[PDB]
Amino acid sequence: KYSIGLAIGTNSVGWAVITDEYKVPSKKFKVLGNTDRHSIKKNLIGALLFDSGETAEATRLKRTARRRYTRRKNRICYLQEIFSNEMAKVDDSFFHRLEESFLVEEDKKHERHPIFGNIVDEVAYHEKYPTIYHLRKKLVDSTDKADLRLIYLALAHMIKFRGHFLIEGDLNPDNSDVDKLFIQLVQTYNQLFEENPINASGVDAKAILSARLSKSRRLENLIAQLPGEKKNGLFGNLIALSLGLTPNFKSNFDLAEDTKLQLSKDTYDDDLDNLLAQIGDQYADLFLAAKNLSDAILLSDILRVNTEITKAPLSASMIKLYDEHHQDLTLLKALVRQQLPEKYKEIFFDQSKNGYAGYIDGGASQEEFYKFIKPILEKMDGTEELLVKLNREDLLRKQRTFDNGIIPHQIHLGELHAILRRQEDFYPFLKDNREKIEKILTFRIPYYVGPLARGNSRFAWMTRKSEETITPWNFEKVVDKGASAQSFIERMTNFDKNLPNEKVLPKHSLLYEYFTVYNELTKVKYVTEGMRKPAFLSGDQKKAIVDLLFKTNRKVTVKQLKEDYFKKIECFDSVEISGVEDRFNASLGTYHDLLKIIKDKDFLDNEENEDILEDIVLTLTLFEDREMIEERLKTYAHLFDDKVMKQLKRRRYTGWGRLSRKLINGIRDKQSGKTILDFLKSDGFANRNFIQLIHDDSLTFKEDIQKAQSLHEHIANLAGSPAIKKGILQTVKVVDELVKVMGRHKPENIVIEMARSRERMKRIEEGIKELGSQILKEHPVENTQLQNEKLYLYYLQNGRDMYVDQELDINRLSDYDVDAIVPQSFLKDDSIDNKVLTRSDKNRGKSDNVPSEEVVKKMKNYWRQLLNAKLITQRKFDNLTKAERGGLSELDKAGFIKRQLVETRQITKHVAQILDSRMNTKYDENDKLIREVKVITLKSKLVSDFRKDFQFYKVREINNYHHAHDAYLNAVVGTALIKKYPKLESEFVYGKATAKYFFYSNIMNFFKTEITLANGEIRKRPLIETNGETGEIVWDKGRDFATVRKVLSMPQVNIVKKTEVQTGGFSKESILPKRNSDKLIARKKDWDPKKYGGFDSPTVAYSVLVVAKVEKGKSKKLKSVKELLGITIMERSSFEKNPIDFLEAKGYKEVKKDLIIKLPKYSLFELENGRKRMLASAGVLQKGNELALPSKYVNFLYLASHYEPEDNEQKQLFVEQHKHYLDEIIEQISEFSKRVILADANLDKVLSAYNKHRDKPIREQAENIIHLFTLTNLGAPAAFKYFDTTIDRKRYTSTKEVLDATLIHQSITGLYETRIDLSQLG
RNA sequence: AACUCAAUUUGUAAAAAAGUUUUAGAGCUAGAAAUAGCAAGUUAAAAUAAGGCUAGUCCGUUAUCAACUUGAAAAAGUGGCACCGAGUCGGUGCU
DNA sequence: CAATAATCTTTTTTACAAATTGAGT
DNA sequence: AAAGATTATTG
């Protein structure tokens, strides 16, 4: 009889077998292979280590981007096919030259100048048009005919890099003068309000509305110049619209619901129509003048510089940039010549430095260029004008930059359209394809249709209603964007868990809301004078109340139910009502929504149209796109008014319920033949409801529901990080093997335990603008300094105290406290959602509770402001303010300390279910579950407190045994807990308030000998703990603390690192320039890396043992070899397909095919003196040994480093009394290193660095001695520091030695082993 | 088990802007030559996992993997127990 | 051969679905 | 976002 302990983690799984005396058994295990060893002894304890499981994210981003690349390529193909025939008459090789532009002249089949084909013309082109934008501008303004070649380039440039689709609608090319168009908004507005004009005299519109400021502040700055206007008044909200904000016009015109408008959304034109249909079209001209301002404000926000008008402002601006670059460089060159000759070569030549040379030809970012040039600019005169251009980031600008991410596609569309309109008179095929070409640029596959696949994509869902090849032009006529738009969502939505083949209804299904109202009503009871008993509402009464009350009001009150049904219908002068207090919770909200819209109660109440209304709601919840909703609702265009349809297309429902239609109003009761909703409408006098009906043995629902319905598959479908899903799956396989080790005798118990800058800035950055604090202007910042908690708080708090209405000085953060909102004595939560930065932690109030009612009544206003800006969370806000809602009650405080010991977590309970269902599988007579194995769950607090309480301290850095020790202690503490308190199986096994406080507080006291409670008392419970009901002995504090002490010291713990084939990217992604080296990899088959460059450093999927011959010398005489060869990820399938041919294509002859050994990463070899090594690749090794340090040096290292009860004399006694343990440890390390590590040069450094610091304090030495275990740790060599002496790593940069050693094939527990001696091969 | 709100984690789709790499933007004067002085520099094309077959405006980096036997695969099957002891596991006895 | 040092693809937006946890009901 | 394998250059 035995029990298994398990410690489940991201990178590890620890396990242990124990018996009823808490002892770890041992066994001798068969050993297989070709050695003489046929048996070996091992302890049934151990751990399993493995690299983290990765999420699918990076994999997805890479695939998403591949599609993007493929589609940009086709955009050009489309455009090249159009020019094809007509381009052939001008240049039968032009497109061929563009393709071949990458190849070197040695490999070019056509002339080497791509555009024209000679050199005199080509050199002349770049002089007239130094940039592609010079050509774009010219092809916009000029009226002369143009070379067909030059038309293509500009057009393809706009199509290749087409800009974003974040703004909807057209842009007007004329709307460009912000000053002019602003006066026209004012003039338009004053035409409407002649009584209260706006005087825009002397208001610099272009200055304020086109400044490089936030659009919020630009609004504020504008309004500031208009005495009279409110920021949220009509003109303010119109300027808000113009500036790209999203204002709300409800107060403006006194209207019902919020009517927000944003010019950039797909809905503005519909949402403006709905507002004009509410205030009158006398405002039509007013909202147009704002739209025209939005266009001109957008431009100024796009261009770094302003240009005298052109139909090509984007290009014209970059010409102004290149032009500005040329004159400022011409200036700076001659400027450095005449003031700093000792630098000109470092600045304009040395690509290794961050001057202008590294700026252009080197790899210097614009920021690095400015960070280098800025001091040099200050040192010289005639400069001040250029440092302005520097700090505005307009100094020597390139045109293709990171900033261009904001150019919307419309801008590129305008130029493309203009060019087409100039040259279509000369070139007829341009005229006929003007819309075709325009569609290549604007067309965008909708996110809801997805990959345009044809049945060979696990990612695609789209349906085709034709079958021809989809193009940007036939898209709407070949793709059923609508059916696929519905698939898009139905793939991901859930099914009814009661009927797992049925889709769940929308959250706003009328059937659902009916179902809810009745399920609430059927349990309402009434009595009054003359009734023996309370009474349910009969069928006739409920139906009456739903028609009478719920189908006229959205919320039905208890007042109405008494007065409008009971009094007016039932004559009941008075009545008492139970089953609903205050008001009903359910509502027919969707019914009232549609009634307020289509305005036909007969059409709503007639059950004939039930399916129509439900399809309307489905459409409104199944879709988000404007166009998609309209196309699906026009099915009801012959049924509803046009004004009705228009307001229908705007309503939107979000949400999906958990029940299906067939469930609520579909399945019957055979017997009675009525549905669940039928039952809810009338159920005799019983008046059952939903929960009682699905569980009612009297009624056939229960039978039919459980009449519905792999392992790794079952684990992949859990919710949780893929890292934990990896550990979980190995956890199960470990159990599955331990049972085989124990003779297929299932255990008694299984104890499981599961381990628990850029983002910070924008949180701050967003928060400060909602409050408009100048606080950053006052106190500048940096993204990397924000991982100092105190500093990060100072900004989240806006530099003000959380508990007193004073502010905080930034310079005295070390004196300010960081206080737990809920005290750590209840729940540990050292995160920002539970901490504040205050001048004194005493100003919260009593330390034993949440912030004082006083403090809330003083600070709630500020806290609310802090939440409005999203600088605290709602979680944080509720905790800050709980005082005014009762504070932490004495029973609440009991829940927090209970939660410290009972695993709440769902994922962990899913783990318990899988094991419990894998073990317990036999059933009994009455069809109940026979529980042979009890699965216990615990939180890490139990064992980690157990360690500290009983001198079993864990030091992680020493080795990996601690994962295995944690699993052992978990089996111990877990089975013992169920031993002493079997009544606690409810909270720990799968299947007056101060009582619960002191109980879970003194949960583990029965381990201790003498208990000291803080109320002044000694209470020594006896030497043997034993159950009250049960007679079974539980815990002999004499034997069993030594039984534990002995296990934790066993020097043999099965440490296994999971062997894994490496997958993922072929190599480092960096594209390196041409060198002469066999290590470069071609980017394309015909692209010689010696000529074109390529990739580098490929990831080895697995190494393989090659025992063959290779031609040696010029005589081609074969020389036997036993090498290890690395099979690249990219190389893998070619090798796997025909290994022998693969190996011969590398120069291997007479390959012994039978001896080819696949050696994945971390494959284990043991050599002399028990020295073990692991494969890191075909020519790198890892350390394979664990250092079995004796426990007494561990606890000493733990205590001598943790120099921070009165029982600490009993702990600090031990360090100074045992200061000799240092020199013992250093050689415990040394004796080990000289045996297995073999890092002679670095071992000296350790000895010479320990000896030098022996004078230092006992604590400084203990800590730094813990660093040294890095030299001895299993795995890959790493650097480490002693004091401040850095010791670089000794790496094992050859694999030759392992080929004559012993390969150790390891079971998941390590207990089963196959040992192969590799010197027996060859 | 319900509801509301909010955060978190996971999974999918559609987009944009960079970065890199080869080529094209005739470098000129001197000097036999290396070397020197000058002039320029901002742009473009193309590739962006090699590639694959199923040929799509699709797919190609997640999950899963000791050994041996059997399987297309998923996966199944394969290894005696007690005591004493403990530097990575030894030793002793039993069928 | 061993020591030593250098390198490592990045940023941004829209749309949706699911658990899951934590605080209010 | 480091880890740690690959690459190259130097003792």
mmCIF file of all heavy atoms in Angstrom, chain A residues 1239-1254:
data_model
loop_
_atom_site.group_PDB
_atom_site.id
_atom_site.type_symbol
_atom_site.label_atom_id
_atom_site.label_comp_id
_atom_site.label_asym_id
_atom_site.label_seq_id
_atom_site.Cartn_x
_atom_site.Cartn_y
_atom_site.Cartn_z
ATOM 1 N N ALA A 1239 36.297 22.093 -14.909
ATOM 2 C CA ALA A 1239 36.521 23.492 -15.253
ATOM 3 C C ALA A 1239 37.707 24.002 -14.441
ATOM 4 O O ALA A 1239 37.573 24.838 -13.540
ATOM 5 C CB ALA A 1239 35.252 24.318 -14.997
ATOM 6 N N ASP A 1240 38.889 23.476 -14.777
ATOM 7 C CA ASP A 1240 40.071 23.699 -13.949
ATOM 8 C C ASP A 1240 40.386 25.182 -13.831
ATOM 9 O O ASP A 1240 40.516 25.714 -12.722
ATOM 10 C CB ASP A 1240 41.265 22.936 -14.526
ATOM 11 C CG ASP A 1240 41.007 21.442 -14.629
ATOM 12 O OD1 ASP A 1240 39.976 20.976 -14.097
ATOM 13 O OD2 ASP A 1240 41.834 20.731 -15.244
ATOM 14 N N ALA A 1241 40.496 25.867 -14.973
ATOM 15 C CA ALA A 1241 40.843 27.285 -14.963
ATOM 16 C C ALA A 1241 39.865 28.092 -14.122
ATOM 17 O O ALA A 1241 40.269 28.993 -13.380
ATOM 18 C CB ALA A 1241 40.888 27.823 -16.392
ATOM 19 N N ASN A 1242 38.574 27.774 -14.208
ATOM 20 C CA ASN A 1242 37.593 28.563 -13.477
ATOM 21 C C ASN A 1242 37.477 28.135 -12.021
ATOM 22 O O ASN A 1242 37.110 28.954 -11.170
ATOM 23 C CB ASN A 1242 36.236 28.491 -14.178
ATOM 24 C CG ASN A 1242 36.255 29.162 -15.536
ATOM 25 O OD1 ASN A 1242 35.929 30.340 -15.664
ATOM 26 N ND2 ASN A 1242 36.658 28.414 -16.560
ATOM 27 N N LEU A 1243 37.794 26.875 -11.705
ATOM 28 C CA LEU A 1243 37.771 26.453 -10.308
ATOM 29 C C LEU A 1243 38.818 27.204 -9.494
ATOM 30 O O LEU A 1243 38.566 27.583 -8.345
ATOM 31 C CB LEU A 1243 37.981 24.944 -10.203
ATOM 32 C CG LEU A 1243 37.721 24.380 -8.805
ATOM 33 C CD1 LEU A 1243 36.428 24.950 -8.215
ATOM 34 C CD2 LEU A 1243 37.704 22.854 -8.820
ATOM 35 N N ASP A 1244 39.997 27.433 -10.077
ATOM 36 C CA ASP A 1244 40.983 28.301 -9.440
ATOM 37 C C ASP A 1244 40.372 29.651 -9.102
ATOM 38 O O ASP A 1244 40.452 30.112 -7.957
ATOM 39 C CB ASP A 1244 42.195 28.488 -10.352
ATOM 40 C CG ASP A 1244 42.987 27.216 -10.539
ATOM 41 O OD1 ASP A 1244 42.754 26.249 -9.779
ATOM 42 O OD2 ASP A 1244 43.837 27.183 -11.455
ATOM 43 N N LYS A 1245 39.746 30.295 -10.093
ATOM 44 C CA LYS A 1245 39.135 31.602 -9.868
ATOM 45 C C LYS A 1245 38.160 31.564 -8.696
ATOM 46 O O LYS A 1245 38.111 32.500 -7.890
ATOM 47 C CB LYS A 1245 38.443 32.083 -11.146
ATOM 48 C CG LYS A 1245 39.372 32.201 -12.359
ATOM 49 C CD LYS A 1245 38.741 33.014 -13.492
ATOM 50 C CE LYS A 1245 38.854 34.520 -13.246
ATOM 51 N NZ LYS A 1245 38.289 35.332 -14.371
ATOM 52 N N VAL A 1246 37.395 30.477 -8.566
ATOM 53 C CA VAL A 1246 36.459 30.371 -7.449
ATOM 54 C C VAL A 1246 37.221 30.285 -6.135
ATOM 55 O O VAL A 1246 36.940 31.024 -5.183
ATOM 56 C CB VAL A 1246 35.520 29.166 -7.629
ATOM 57 C CG1 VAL A 1246 34.682 28.966 -6.383
ATOM 58 C CG2 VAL A 1246 34.616 29.363 -8.818
ATOM 59 N N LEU A 1247 38.203 29.383 -6.066
ATOM 60 C CA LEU A 1247 38.994 29.249 -4.849
ATOM 61 C C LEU A 1247 39.717 30.548 -4.518
ATOM 62 O O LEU A 1247 39.696 31.002 -3.367
ATOM 63 C CB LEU A 1247 39.981 28.097 -5.003
ATOM 64 C CG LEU A 1247 39.275 26.781 -5.317
ATOM 65 C CD1 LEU A 1247 40.280 25.643 -5.473
ATOM 66 C CD2 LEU A 1247 38.221 26.481 -4.245
ATOM 67 N N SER A 1248 40.341 31.175 -5.519
ATOM 68 C CA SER A 1248 41.046 32.427 -5.270
ATOM 69 C C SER A 1248 40.096 33.571 -4.946
ATOM 70 O O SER A 1248 40.522 34.563 -4.351
ATOM 71 C CB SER A 1248 41.910 32.789 -6.475
ATOM 72 O OG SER A 1248 42.631 31.653 -6.922
ATOM 73 N N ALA A 1249 38.820 33.455 -5.305
ATOM 74 C CA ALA A 1249 37.864 34.504 -4.971
ATOM 75 C C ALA A 1249 37.116 34.229 -3.673
ATOM 76 O O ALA A 1249 36.637 35.173 -3.035
ATOM 77 C CB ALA A 1249 36.864 34.697 -6.114
ATOM 78 N N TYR A 1250 36.992 32.963 -3.263
ATOM 79 C CA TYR A 1250 36.478 32.691 -1.925
ATOM 80 C C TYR A 1250 37.517 33.029 -0.868
ATOM 81 O O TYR A 1250 37.195 33.650 0.153
ATOM 82 C CB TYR A 1250 36.057 31.229 -1.789
ATOM 83 C CG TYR A 1250 35.841 30.810 -0.346
ATOM 84 C CD1 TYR A 1250 34.852 31.410 0.428
ATOM 85 C CD2 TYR A 1250 36.635 29.830 0.245
ATOM 86 C CE1 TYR A 1250 34.649 31.043 1.743
ATOM 87 C CE2 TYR A 1250 36.438 29.455 1.565
ATOM 88 C CZ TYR A 1250 35.441 30.067 2.309
ATOM 89 O OH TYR A 1250 35.226 29.711 3.623
ATOM 90 N N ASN A 1251 38.773 32.627 -1.100
ATOM 91 C CA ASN A 1251 39.837 32.873 -0.131
ATOM 92 C C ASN A 1251 40.029 34.363 0.115
ATOM 93 O O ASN A 1251 40.280 34.785 1.251
ATOM 94 C CB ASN A 1251 41.144 32.237 -0.612
ATOM 95 C CG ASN A 1251 41.102 30.720 -0.581
ATOM 96 O OD1 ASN A 1251 40.335 30.123 0.176
ATOM 97 N ND2 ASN A 1251 41.930 30.089 -1.409
ATOM 98 N N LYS A 1252 39.903 35.176 -0.940
ATOM 99 C CA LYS A 1252 40.131 36.615 -0.821
ATOM 100 C C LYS A 1252 39.052 37.295 0.017
ATOM 101 O O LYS A 1252 39.317 38.325 0.649
ATOM 102 C CB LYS A 1252 40.215 37.237 -2.222
ATOM 103 C CG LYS A 1252 40.164 38.769 -2.277
ATOM 104 C CD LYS A 1252 41.333 39.411 -1.528
ATOM 105 C CE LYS A 1252 40.927 40.735 -0.882
ATOM 106 N NZ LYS A 1252 39.822 40.572 0.112
ATOM 107 N N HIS A 1253 37.844 36.735 0.059
ATOM 108 C CA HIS A 1253 36.736 37.367 0.761
ATOM 109 C C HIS A 1253 36.366 36.644 2.051
ATOM 110 O O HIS A 1253 35.283 36.886 2.597
ATOM 111 C CB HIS A 1253 35.521 37.468 -0.160
ATOM 112 C CG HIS A 1253 35.688 38.455 -1.274
ATOM 113 N ND1 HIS A 1253 36.574 38.263 -2.314
ATOM 114 C CD2 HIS A 1253 35.080 39.642 -1.513
ATOM 115 C CE1 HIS A 1253 36.505 39.289 -3.144
ATOM 116 N NE2 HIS A 1253 35.607 40.139 -2.682
ATOM 117 N N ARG A 1254 37.243 35.765 2.555
ATOM 118 C CA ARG A 1254 36.973 35.091 3.822
ATOM 119 C C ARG A 1254 36.820 36.079 4.974
ATOM 120 O O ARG A 1254 36.147 35.763 5.962
ATOM 121 C CB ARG A 1254 38.086 34.084 4.140
ATOM 122 C CG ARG A 1254 38.276 32.991 3.101
ATOM 123 C CD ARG A 1254 39.182 31.879 3.612
ATOM 124 N NE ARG A 1254 40.584 32.097 3.256
ATOM 125 C CZ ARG A 1254 41.441 31.116 2.980
ATOM 126 N NH1 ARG A 1254 41.036 29.849 3.012
ATOM 127 N NH2 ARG A 1254 42.701 31.395 2.669
#
